Amino acid sequence: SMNPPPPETSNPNKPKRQTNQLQYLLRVVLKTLWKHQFAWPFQQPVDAVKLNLPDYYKIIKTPMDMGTIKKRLENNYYWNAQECIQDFNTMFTNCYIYNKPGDDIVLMAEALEKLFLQKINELPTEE
Ligand SMILES: COc1nc2c(Nc3ccccc3C(C)(C)C)c(C(=O)O)cnc2cc1-c1c(C)noc1C
């Protein structure tokens, strides 16, 4: 079985918090990206078996995807907004590292990242 286990989306020992910034990340940022027409390759872990990408998890050792991020937010997995922002950045970076510049999947990622940065520029202050 050559896919790794997916990133965890819950952990009984990891402290849980809700902040208005994490609420914004779920309700505005994730929602906007999730429903975007380019989102679908990013909505679940890369299935390197089904996609016939045998080298994927030889190259990418910190996988991340919006399905995992969405569940982490829904599960209050994150303590702060930076943890979630880091996961989005990891997802984009992995795409830019594994694929060739100018590939369609890279252009899709770049479009999602542009929207992402726009929404993060508008992050609300903590209540
Ligand atoms: C090419 O990069 C991906 N492609 C798919 C994918 N199929 C797809 C999508 C667009 C263009 C080309 C393809 C191939 C069929 C050639 C793989 C699918 C799918 O068809 O279900 C799902 N998830 C992906 C994640 C990724 C991906 C992401 C996201 N980051 O790195 C990789 C690799």
Side-chain angles (χ1 to χ4, degrees):
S1 305
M2 188 137 91
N3 292 313
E8 66 178 23
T9 55
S10 60
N11 184 330
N13 298 129
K14 190 178 179 303
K16 308 165 59 180
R17 197 163 68 146
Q18 192 53 282
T19 71
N20 66 294
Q21 289 185 335
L22 283 166
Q23 283 174 345
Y24 174 90
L25 280 161
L26 179 56
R27 297 176 186 173
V28 181
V29 182
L30 184 286
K31 174 57 88 163
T32 292
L33 271 66
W34 185 265
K35 288 304 201 69
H36 190 278
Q37 58 270 30
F38 295 163
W40 60 269
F42 303 95
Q43 287 177 335
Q44 61 285 308
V46 177
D47 186 337
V49 176
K50 296 303 168 61
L51 300 174
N52 203 359
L53 299 177
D55 62 350
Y56 184 81
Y57 291 111
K58 302 183 168 73
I59 293 172
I60 298 304
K61 306 297 188 177
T62 54
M64 187 51 58
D65 65 279
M66 290 202 294
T68 299
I69 296 168
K70 177 172 188 286
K71 288 183 174 316
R72 282 177 173 196
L73 286 163
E74 293 168 344
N75 295 347
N76 302 128
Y77 179 85
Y78 299 120
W79 188 260
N80 65 39
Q82 289 306 325
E83 288 177 309
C84 175
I85 290 164
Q86 281 170 35
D87 280 347
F88 274 106
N89 281 331
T90 294
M91 180 185 80
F92 292 128
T93 296
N94 289 342
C95 185
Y96 300 148
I97 285 172
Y98 181 77
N99 303 283
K100 296 183 179 188
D103 286 351
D104 281 350
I105 189 71
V106 174
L107 303 174
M108 293 168 80
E110 285 178 339
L112 295 169
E113 189 186 14
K114 178 184 183 165
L115 196 55
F116 171 74
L117 294 170
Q118 291 172 353
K119 296 294 185 171
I120 294 300
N121 190 30
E122 292 157 9
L123 195 69
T125 50
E126 319 179 79
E127 284 176 10

